């Protein structure tokens, strides 16, 4: 038996509300952050055209064996869809459009929990927009109808580069966290419980096909969910776990059926999972708002405790924006300035601590020029930028300032503090942000 979780919130914005996606996301945040995910239906006439040749775009999908708590060939879009439809109609012995969504959901959770069944499916997942092309129109002759949607904020190609996005002036290739990803689904293909890199937002648009079923958990319950999954499946790596099991342990869970033409938004640190009802085509991108900035700093601290790799350096992003203060949105400048003040005070305290450990020598270093795998802390794997410690006895190795004692057997007077900026360089950068924000 499966008891469906309660429905997440659904918004139907007016044209005035819809005109600015970041203003609308900030508007709904008080409600939606209490449920982790939400759904947005655009105005009825917002109808971006989709054009793909089903025969000229190829992919190799991942094979999925349906098993709860458990951690190939080439298709065209046409041949995948023929495989997908025949699978679903043979599975239920019905036409695909007659299979109720409540029954597919019930059957999915039965399937993953029975070991007597060996059902396997395929999922065209994490296809890069760069090779395959986007489902939204982009500049590359386009029709006037496609030109109408080129500059829409809800065209997911635009959202990362708008002024309210805090990566808009970041030119580093912060790994496809600025380019959309595509997902070609079939019946029962799924995504496991997870949160986004650096606790970012995500936004997902279903271009066409049968619905995508979601489950979501609010950001405030993240550690509660993690404690529950540690007790029940310590081997974890992500997995499928029945939402009724989380609910039994007092974790709040919400559901929705996302249909063609609808958006789903996930909020910072919000766990989510789901599965596809049938053949469909989705597109998604990550993004970061000013709301997110202090959570982004908390996230990198949490990664350090766990010894987890970073996708980018948060401090490097902050300093890059400071160096472009004159072209930032004024509310962006204000919020970056507050995060930078915390950064500088934490950095000041860390440098005093390592000096009292006996590190005396020092030298400026342009960390941003090193490949990422050449500037990770030996102990905690954090990506260094503000500063690190090196030792002549172990060339090329770095520790962050929390892990001075983990580098060398040599005494600390043989160490060197490598630093990007003096404290005296940092305070004028923060003042430029203040001037920008106060005007
Ligand atoms: C830069 C590193 C890289 O290349 N990666 C590959 C893509 N990875 C994204 C994984 C991810 C995150 N969230 N989902 C997900 N969320 C919601 C809905 C989804 C769906 O419908 N189907 C699949 N995945 C979904 C996937 C980042 C790392
Ligand atoms: Mn996700
Ligand atoms: Mn440690
Ligand atoms: Zn470290």
Short mmCIF file of C-alpha atoms and ligand atoms in Angstrom, two decimals:
data_model
loop_
_atom_site.label_atom_id
_atom_site.label_comp_id
_atom_site.label_asym_id
_atom_site.label_seq_id
_atom_site.Cartn_x
_atom_site.Cartn_y
_atom_site.Cartn_z
CA UNK A 1 0.00 0.00 0.00
CA UNK A 2 1.10 3.57 -0.86
CA UNK A 3 -0.31 6.70 0.78
CA UNK A 4 0.44 9.64 -1.57
CA UNK A 5 2.13 12.62 0.14
CA UNK A 6 0.20 15.92 0.15
CA UNK A 7 0.42 18.16 -2.92
CA UNK A 8 3.08 20.88 -3.10
CA UNK A 9 1.95 24.48 -3.84
CA UNK A 10 0.91 25.49 -7.39
CA UNK A 11 1.19 29.09 -8.65
CA UNK A 12 -0.55 30.64 -11.68
CA UNK A 13 1.13 34.04 -12.15
CA UNK A 14 -0.38 36.91 -14.13
CA UNK A 15 1.55 38.49 -16.98
CA UNK A 16 2.73 41.28 -14.67
CA UNK A 17 3.93 38.70 -12.12
CA UNK A 18 5.41 36.42 -14.80
CA UNK A 19 7.41 39.19 -16.51
CA UNK A 20 10.35 38.88 -14.07
CA UNK A 21 11.21 35.34 -12.91
CA UNK A 22 13.57 36.40 -10.10
CA UNK A 23 11.07 38.87 -8.64
CA UNK A 24 8.38 36.18 -8.74
CA UNK A 25 10.63 33.51 -7.17
CA UNK A 26 11.45 35.95 -4.35
CA UNK A 27 7.72 36.67 -3.98
CA UNK A 28 6.74 33.00 -3.51
CA UNK A 29 9.76 32.05 -1.38
CA UNK A 30 8.01 32.36 2.04
CA UNK A 31 5.52 29.66 1.00
CA UNK A 32 7.63 27.46 -1.27
CA UNK A 33 10.67 27.15 0.99
CA UNK A 34 8.36 25.43 3.51
CA UNK A 35 7.71 22.61 1.00
CA UNK A 36 11.05 22.37 -0.88
CA UNK A 37 9.51 22.20 -4.39
CA UNK A 38 6.71 24.08 -6.11
CA UNK A 39 5.00 24.17 -9.52
CA UNK A 40 4.47 27.23 -11.77
CA UNK A 41 1.95 27.33 -14.65
CA UNK A 42 2.79 30.15 -17.11
CA UNK A 43 0.11 32.40 -18.62
CA UNK A 44 -1.97 30.36 -21.09
CA UNK A 45 -0.61 32.10 -24.22
CA UNK A 46 3.07 31.72 -23.20
CA UNK A 47 3.77 28.92 -25.70
CA UNK A 48 7.45 28.55 -26.67
CA UNK A 49 7.71 26.53 -29.89
CA UNK A 50 9.66 23.26 -29.87
CA UNK A 51 11.24 22.00 -33.10
CA UNK A 52 13.41 18.89 -33.25
CA UNK A 53 14.12 16.35 -35.97
CA UNK A 54 13.51 13.01 -34.26
CA UNK A 55 15.95 11.23 -36.62
CA UNK A 56 19.07 13.46 -36.45
CA UNK A 57 19.76 13.55 -32.70
CA UNK A 58 21.33 10.50 -31.02
CA UNK A 59 22.10 9.47 -27.45
CA UNK A 60 23.10 6.45 -25.35
CA UNK A 61 20.92 6.17 -22.21
CA UNK A 62 21.81 4.78 -18.81
CA UNK A 63 20.36 1.42 -17.79
CA UNK A 64 18.31 1.45 -14.58
CA UNK A 65 17.54 -1.62 -12.47
CA UNK A 66 14.58 -0.80 -10.23
CA UNK A 67 15.59 -1.65 -6.64
CA UNK A 68 14.88 0.39 -3.49
CA UNK A 69 17.83 1.31 -1.22
CA UNK A 70 20.36 0.20 -3.89
CA UNK A 71 23.11 2.72 -4.72
CA UNK A 72 23.71 -0.33 -23.64
CA UNK A 73 23.04 0.95 -27.17
CA UNK A 74 22.46 4.07 -29.29
CA UNK A 75 18.97 5.47 -29.92
CA UNK A 76 17.55 8.32 -31.91
CA UNK A 77 14.75 10.29 -30.30
CA UNK A 78 12.40 8.39 -32.62
CA UNK A 79 13.64 4.88 -31.80
CA UNK A 80 13.77 5.66 -28.06
CA UNK A 81 10.15 6.81 -28.17
CA UNK A 82 9.11 3.66 -30.02
CA UNK A 83 10.87 1.52 -27.38
CA UNK A 84 9.33 3.57 -24.56
CA UNK A 85 5.70 3.42 -25.79
CA UNK A 86 5.81 -0.32 -26.52
CA UNK A 87 7.28 -0.98 -23.04
CA UNK A 88 4.49 0.89 -21.23
CA UNK A 89 1.62 -0.50 -23.30
CA UNK A 90 2.96 -4.06 -22.98
CA UNK A 91 3.47 -3.59 -19.22
CA UNK A 92 -0.16 -2.70 -18.56
CA UNK A 93 -1.79 -4.26 -21.67
CA UNK A 94 -3.49 -0.86 -22.31
CA UNK A 95 -3.12 2.19 -24.60
CA UNK A 96 -0.52 4.50 -23.04
CA UNK A 97 -2.95 7.41 -22.51
CA UNK A 98 -5.44 5.26 -20.63
CA UNK A 99 -3.07 4.32 -17.78
CA UNK A 100 -4.03 6.37 -14.68
CA UNK A 101 -1.18 8.32 -13.07
CA UNK A 102 -2.16 7.07 -9.59
CA UNK A 103 -1.71 3.48 -10.82
CA UNK A 104 1.74 4.06 -12.34
CA UNK A 105 2.82 5.70 -9.05
CA UNK A 106 1.45 2.78 -6.99
CA UNK A 107 3.18 0.29 -9.29
CA UNK A 108 6.52 2.14 -9.21
CA UNK A 109 6.77 1.90 -5.42
CA UNK A 110 5.67 -1.75 -5.50
CA UNK A 111 8.34 -2.51 -8.11
CA UNK A 112 11.34 -1.03 -6.31
CA UNK A 113 10.48 -2.88 -3.08
CA UNK A 114 9.90 -6.41 -4.50
CA UNK A 115 12.96 -8.58 -5.10
CA UNK A 116 11.00 -11.20 -7.08
CA UNK A 117 10.85 -8.63 -9.95
CA UNK A 118 13.77 -7.69 -12.21
CA UNK A 119 12.36 -4.71 -14.14
CA UNK A 120 14.97 -2.58 -15.93
CA UNK A 121 14.44 0.63 -17.96
CA UNK A 122 16.59 3.24 -19.73
CA UNK A 123 16.88 7.01 -19.21
CA UNK A 124 18.39 9.56 -21.58
CA UNK A 125 19.73 11.62 -18.69
CA UNK A 126 22.18 14.53 -18.35
CA UNK A 127 22.41 15.14 -22.08
CA UNK A 128 24.41 18.35 -22.54
CA UNK A 129 22.67 21.28 -24.24
CA UNK A 130 26.00 22.08 -25.96
CA UNK A 131 26.04 18.96 -28.15
CA UNK A 132 22.30 18.21 -28.51
CA UNK A 133 20.93 21.78 -28.57
CA UNK A 134 18.33 23.38 -26.31
CA UNK A 135 14.57 22.92 -26.42
CA UNK A 136 14.19 26.73 -26.23
CA UNK A 137 15.12 29.00 -29.17
CA UNK A 138 18.64 30.47 -29.27
CA UNK A 139 20.54 32.82 -31.56
CA UNK A 140 22.59 30.96 -34.20
CA UNK A 141 16.89 31.99 -39.67
CA UNK A 142 14.31 31.97 -36.88
CA UNK A 143 10.58 32.59 -37.25
CA UNK A 144 8.98 35.64 -35.58
CA UNK A 145 7.28 33.23 -33.13
CA UNK A 146 10.69 31.83 -32.08
CA UNK A 147 12.11 35.37 -31.86
CA UNK A 148 9.36 36.26 -29.36
CA UNK A 149 10.91 33.84 -26.84
CA UNK A 150 14.63 34.50 -27.43
CA UNK A 151 14.93 36.99 -24.57
CA UNK A 152 12.30 35.66 -22.15
CA UNK A 153 13.61 35.29 -18.61
CA UNK A 154 11.90 31.87 -18.43
CA UNK A 155 13.85 30.68 -21.47
CA UNK A 156 16.25 28.63 -19.35
CA UNK A 157 19.25 29.69 -21.48
CA UNK A 158 18.81 33.28 -20.28
CA UNK A 159 18.21 32.76 -16.57
CA UNK A 160 21.90 32.23 -15.58
CA UNK A 161 23.04 35.51 -17.18
CA UNK A 162 20.39 37.91 -15.95
CA UNK A 163 21.44 40.66 -13.53
CA UNK A 164 19.68 39.10 -10.51
CA UNK A 165 21.75 35.91 -10.93
CA UNK A 166 24.98 36.04 -8.92
CA UNK A 167 26.91 34.03 -11.55
CA UNK A 168 25.99 36.53 -14.30
CA UNK A 169 29.44 38.20 -14.22
CA UNK A 170 31.36 34.98 -13.41
CA UNK A 171 33.24 34.04 -16.58
CA UNK A 172 34.81 30.84 -15.23
CA UNK A 173 33.21 27.64 -16.53
CA UNK A 174 31.49 26.66 -13.28
CA UNK A 175 31.00 22.96 -14.62
CA UNK A 176 27.29 22.91 -16.61
CA UNK A 177 25.88 25.02 -13.77
CA UNK A 178 25.30 27.72 -16.42
CA UNK A 179 24.16 25.57 -19.41
CA UNK A 180 20.88 23.58 -19.47
CA UNK A 181 20.63 19.79 -19.30
CA UNK A 182 18.13 17.60 -21.16
CA UNK A 183 16.26 14.49 -19.94
CA UNK A 184 14.47 12.05 -22.27
CA UNK A 185 12.24 9.82 -20.11
CA UNK A 186 10.21 6.60 -20.32
CA UNK A 187 7.76 4.90 -17.92
CA UNK A 188 9.46 4.23 -14.50
CA UNK A 189 12.80 5.92 -15.37
CA UNK A 190 13.79 7.77 -12.22
CA UNK A 191 16.02 10.13 -10.25
CA UNK A 192 17.19 9.28 -6.70
CA UNK A 193 17.03 11.44 -3.58
CA UNK A 194 19.56 14.29 -3.83
CA UNK A 195 20.27 18.00 -3.34
CA UNK A 196 21.96 20.34 -5.84
CA UNK A 197 25.68 21.18 -5.89
CA UNK A 198 26.53 24.08 -3.52
CA UNK A 199 22.86 23.97 -2.32
CA UNK A 200 21.76 25.91 -5.41
CA UNK A 201 18.24 26.34 -6.80
CA UNK A 202 17.10 24.45 -9.87
CA UNK A 203 14.32 25.05 -12.42
CA UNK A 204 12.89 22.34 -14.68
CA UNK A 205 10.59 22.70 -17.71
CA UNK A 206 8.68 19.80 -19.28
CA UNK A 207 8.59 20.59 -23.01
CA UNK A 208 6.22 17.76 -24.03
CA UNK A 209 5.10 14.17 -23.34
CA UNK A 210 3.57 12.34 -20.36
CA UNK A 211 3.98 13.78 -16.85
CA UNK A 212 6.98 13.77 -14.48
CA UNK A 213 6.12 12.80 -10.88
CA UNK A 214 8.13 14.55 -8.11
CA UNK A 215 8.66 14.23 -4.35
CA UNK A 216 10.25 17.07 -2.37
CA UNK A 217 11.41 17.88 1.19
CA UNK A 218 11.94 21.42 2.60
CA UNK A 219 15.45 22.71 3.23
CA UNK A 220 14.94 22.87 6.99
CA UNK A 221 14.45 19.06 7.18
CA UNK A 222 17.61 18.14 5.25
CA UNK A 223 19.61 16.83 8.21
CA UNK A 224 16.55 15.02 9.56
CA UNK A 225 16.20 13.12 6.26
CA UNK A 226 19.92 12.32 6.24
CA UNK A 227 19.74 10.88 9.77
CA UNK A 228 16.82 8.68 8.69
CA UNK A 229 18.65 7.36 5.65
CA UNK A 230 21.81 6.68 7.70
CA UNK A 231 19.90 4.38 10.09
CA UNK A 232 18.10 2.43 7.35
CA UNK A 233 20.74 2.12 4.59
CA UNK A 234 24.21 2.80 6.03
CA UNK A 235 26.02 1.62 2.88
CA UNK A 236 25.39 5.07 1.36
CA UNK A 237 26.05 7.34 -3.85
CA UNK A 238 22.30 8.11 -3.97
CA UNK A 239 19.24 5.87 -3.70
CA UNK A 240 15.47 5.38 -4.08
CA UNK A 241 13.56 5.33 -0.77
CA UNK A 242 9.79 5.19 -0.33
CA UNK A 243 8.38 8.60 0.73
CA UNK A 244 6.01 6.84 3.18
CA UNK A 245 9.12 5.66 5.06
CA UNK A 246 10.33 9.25 5.52
CA UNK A 247 6.82 10.34 6.55
CA UNK A 248 6.71 7.53 9.13
CA UNK A 249 9.83 9.08 10.67
CA UNK A 250 8.28 12.59 10.70
CA UNK A 251 10.07 14.01 7.66
CA UNK A 252 7.69 16.31 5.70
CA UNK A 253 7.30 15.18 2.05
CA UNK A 254 5.26 16.79 -0.79
CA UNK A 255 4.37 15.47 -4.28
CA UNK A 256 3.25 16.77 -7.68
CA UNK A 257 2.57 15.61 -11.26
CA UNK A 258 4.39 18.08 -13.53
CA UNK A 259 2.63 18.16 -16.92
CA UNK A 260 3.75 19.45 -20.32
CA UNK A 261 4.21 23.22 -20.29
CA UNK A 262 4.79 23.49 -16.53
CA UNK A 263 7.83 24.44 -14.42
CA UNK A 264 9.05 22.90 -11.16
CA UNK A 265 11.41 24.90 -8.89
CA UNK A 266 13.57 23.37 -6.13
CA UNK A 267 14.87 25.57 -3.30
CA UNK A 268 18.28 25.55 -1.53
CA UNK A 269 19.13 22.26 0.27
CA UNK A 270 15.68 20.81 -0.66
CA UNK A 271 15.89 17.02 -1.20
CA UNK A 272 13.98 15.72 -4.22
CA UNK A 273 13.41 12.49 -6.22
CA UNK A 274 10.92 11.22 -8.79
CA UNK A 275 10.07 9.19 -11.89
CA UNK A 276 8.55 9.61 -15.35
CA UNK A 277 5.02 8.43 -16.27
CA UNK A 278 5.96 7.75 -19.91
CA UNK A 279 7.83 9.11 -22.95
CA UNK A 280 8.72 12.79 -22.33
CA UNK A 281 11.32 15.57 -22.82
CA UNK A 282 12.55 17.90 -20.06
CA UNK A 283 15.16 20.70 -19.69
CA UNK A 284 16.72 22.06 -16.48
CA UNK A 285 19.35 24.50 -15.15
CA UNK A 286 20.81 25.45 -11.74
CA UNK A 287 20.86 29.03 -10.46
CA UNK A 288 21.90 31.21 -7.51
CA UNK A 289 20.11 34.34 -6.18
CA UNK A 290 21.10 36.91 -3.55
CA UNK A 291 18.86 34.94 -1.14
CA UNK A 292 21.25 32.01 -1.62
CA UNK A 293 24.63 33.70 -0.94
CA UNK A 294 24.94 33.00 2.83
CA UNK A 295 23.71 29.42 2.27
CA UNK A 296 26.43 29.02 -0.36
CA UNK A 297 29.04 29.92 2.28
CA UNK A 298 27.48 27.50 4.81
CA UNK A 299 27.53 24.78 2.13
CA UNK A 300 31.30 25.02 1.51
CA UNK A 301 31.90 24.86 5.27
CA UNK A 302 29.73 21.72 5.35
CA UNK A 303 31.72 20.23 2.43
CA UNK A 304 34.94 20.78 4.41
CA UNK A 305 33.59 18.89 7.44
CA UNK A 306 32.69 16.02 5.10
CA UNK A 307 35.91 16.12 3.01
CA UNK A 308 33.72 16.59 -0.11
CA UNK A 309 35.03 18.18 -3.32
CA UNK A 310 33.77 21.64 -4.37
CA UNK A 311 32.50 22.56 -7.82
CA UNK A 312 33.89 26.09 -7.53
CA UNK A 313 35.47 28.38 -4.95
CA UNK A 314 32.80 30.50 -3.26
CA UNK A 315 35.36 33.10 -2.09
CA UNK A 316 36.77 33.39 -5.62
CA UNK A 317 33.25 34.12 -6.91
CA UNK A 318 32.75 36.81 -4.21
CA UNK A 319 36.05 38.53 -5.07
CA UNK A 320 35.34 38.40 -8.81
CA UNK A 321 32.05 40.27 -8.27
CA UNK A 322 33.81 42.82 -6.04
CA UNK A 323 36.27 43.51 -8.86
CA UNK A 324 33.25 44.30 -11.10
CA UNK A 325 31.32 46.36 -8.51
CA UNK A 326 30.51 49.18 -10.94
CA UNK A 327 28.40 46.88 -13.19
CA UNK A 328 26.49 44.96 -10.53
CA UNK A 329 22.82 45.30 -9.80
CA UNK A 330 22.64 47.53 -6.71
CA UNK A 331 20.83 44.92 -4.59
CA UNK A 332 23.42 42.37 -5.68
CA UNK A 333 26.22 44.74 -4.62
CA UNK A 334 24.62 45.18 -1.18
CA UNK A 335 24.27 41.43 -0.53
CA UNK A 336 27.77 40.56 -1.82
CA UNK A 337 29.19 43.24 0.45
CA UNK A 338 27.65 41.60 3.53
CA UNK A 339 29.06 38.15 2.65
CA UNK A 340 32.47 39.69 1.94
CA UNK A 341 32.57 41.28 5.41
CA UNK A 342 32.14 37.84 6.98
CA UNK A 343 34.78 36.40 4.63
CA UNK A 344 37.32 39.05 5.64
CA UNK A 345 36.73 38.62 9.38
CA UNK A 346 37.01 34.82 9.16
CA UNK A 347 40.20 35.21 7.08
CA UNK A 348 41.74 37.64 9.57
CA UNK A 349 41.17 35.17 12.45
CA UNK A 350 42.61 32.21 10.49
CA UNK A 351 45.79 34.10 9.59
CA UNK A 352 46.39 35.09 13.22
CA UNK A 353 46.00 31.42 14.23
CA UNK A 354 48.59 30.13 11.74
CA UNK A 355 51.07 32.88 12.68
CA UNK A 356 50.82 31.76 16.32
CA UNK A 357 51.63 28.23 15.08
CA UNK A 358 55.00 29.54 13.85
CA UNK A 359 54.39 30.11 10.11
CA UNK A 360 56.42 33.22 9.36
CA UNK A 361 57.35 33.32 5.67
CA UNK A 362 54.68 34.35 3.12
CA UNK A 363 54.24 35.14 -0.60
CA UNK A 364 51.37 36.37 -2.81
CA UNK A 365 49.87 33.71 -5.08
CA UNK A 366 47.31 33.90 -7.95
CA UNK A 367 45.28 30.82 -7.00
CA UNK A 368 42.76 31.41 -9.79
CA UNK A 369 45.45 30.43 -12.37
CA UNK A 370 45.94 26.92 -10.93
CA UNK A 371 43.82 24.05 -12.27
CA UNK A 372 41.32 22.99 -9.61
CA UNK A 373 43.00 19.67 -8.86
CA UNK A 374 46.23 21.55 -8.11
CA UNK A 375 44.74 23.70 -5.32
CA UNK A 376 42.71 21.30 -3.15
CA UNK A 377 43.46 20.89 0.55
CA UNK A 378 45.28 17.60 1.18
CA UNK A 379 43.06 16.89 4.21
CA UNK A 380 39.56 18.23 3.47
CA UNK A 381 39.68 18.61 -0.38
CA UNK A 382 38.43 22.21 -0.28
CA UNK A 383 39.30 24.41 -3.27
CA UNK A 384 41.71 27.07 -1.95
CA UNK A 385 41.60 30.75 -3.00
CA UNK A 386 42.02 33.21 -0.11
CA UNK A 387 45.09 31.35 1.28
CA UNK A 388 46.89 28.03 1.81
CA UNK A 389 50.07 26.61 3.41
CA UNK A 390 52.94 25.02 1.44
CA UNK A 391 56.17 23.25 2.50
CA UNK A 392 59.39 22.94 0.49
CA UNK A 393 59.59 19.35 1.80
CA UNK A 394 56.39 18.36 -0.12
CA UNK A 395 56.33 20.31 -3.39
CA UNK A 396 53.00 21.09 -4.99
CA UNK A 397 50.92 20.13 -1.95
CA UNK A 398 48.58 22.56 -0.18
CA UNK A 399 46.52 22.59 3.00
CA UNK A 400 43.87 25.15 3.87
CA UNK A 401 44.39 27.18 7.03
CA UNK A 402 42.27 24.79 9.12
CA UNK A 403 44.67 21.92 8.42
CA UNK A 404 48.15 23.38 8.92
CA UNK A 405 49.16 20.31 10.94
CA UNK A 406 48.30 17.84 8.11
CA UNK A 407 50.93 18.74 5.46
CA UNK A 408 54.61 18.10 6.34
CA UNK A 409 56.64 16.46 9.10
CA UNK A 410 58.89 19.54 8.86
CA UNK A 411 58.75 22.25 11.57
CA UNK A 412 56.47 25.21 10.80
CA UNK A 413 59.24 27.75 10.23
CA UNK A 414 59.82 25.86 6.95
CA UNK A 415 56.23 26.60 5.87
CA UNK A 416 55.01 29.47 3.74
CA UNK A 417 51.67 31.26 3.81
CA UNK A 418 50.41 31.62 0.20
CA UNK A 419 47.78 34.36 -0.07
CA UNK A 420 45.72 36.01 -2.80
CA UNK A 421 45.28 39.45 -1.15
CA UNK A 422 46.60 41.30 1.85
CA UNK A 423 43.96 42.46 4.30
CA UNK A 424 44.78 46.00 3.14
CA UNK A 425 43.86 45.03 -0.46
CA UNK A 426 40.55 43.54 0.66
CA UNK A 427 38.93 46.53 2.40
CA UNK A 428 38.94 48.83 -0.69
CA UNK A 429 37.25 46.07 -2.74
CA UNK A 430 34.45 45.94 -0.20
CA UNK A 431 34.16 49.75 -0.26
CA UNK A 432 33.55 49.74 -4.02
CA UNK A 433 30.57 47.47 -3.37
CA UNK A 434 29.33 49.92 -0.72
CA UNK A 435 29.55 52.92 -3.08
CA UNK A 436 27.67 50.95 -5.73
CA UNK A 437 24.97 49.85 -3.27
CA UNK A 438 24.48 53.26 -1.60
CA UNK A 439 23.70 54.97 -4.93
C1 LIG B 1 29.29 19.79 -13.73
C2 LIG B 1 29.20 18.34 -13.31
C3 LIG B 1 28.32 17.56 -14.25
O1 LIG B 1 28.58 17.47 -15.43
N1 LIG B 1 27.23 16.96 -13.71
C4 LIG B 1 26.27 16.17 -14.49
C5 LIG B 1 24.87 16.66 -14.23
N2 LIG B 1 24.57 16.60 -12.80
C6 LIG B 1 23.17 16.93 -12.51
C7 LIG B 1 22.49 15.81 -11.73
C8 LIG B 1 21.10 16.20 -11.31
C9 LIG B 1 20.69 17.17 -10.36
N3 LIG B 1 19.38 17.22 -10.22
N4 LIG B 1 18.92 16.27 -11.09
C10 LIG B 1 17.51 16.06 -11.24
N5 LIG B 1 16.75 16.88 -10.50
C11 LIG B 1 15.45 16.99 -10.78
C12 LIG B 1 14.81 16.31 -11.80
C13 LIG B 1 15.57 15.42 -12.55
C14 LIG B 1 14.94 14.62 -13.63
O2 LIG B 1 13.81 14.85 -14.05
N6 LIG B 1 15.81 13.68 -14.17
C15 LIG B 1 17.10 13.53 -13.78
N7 LIG B 1 17.70 14.26 -12.87
C16 LIG B 1 16.93 15.23 -12.26
C17 LIG B 1 19.92 15.66 -11.76
C18 LIG B 1 25.49 17.50 -12.09
C19 LIG B 1 26.92 17.03 -12.28
MN1 LIG B 2 17.99 17.82 -8.94
MN1 LIG B 3 38.86 17.08 9.91
ZN1 LIG B 4 41.55 21.73 4.70
#
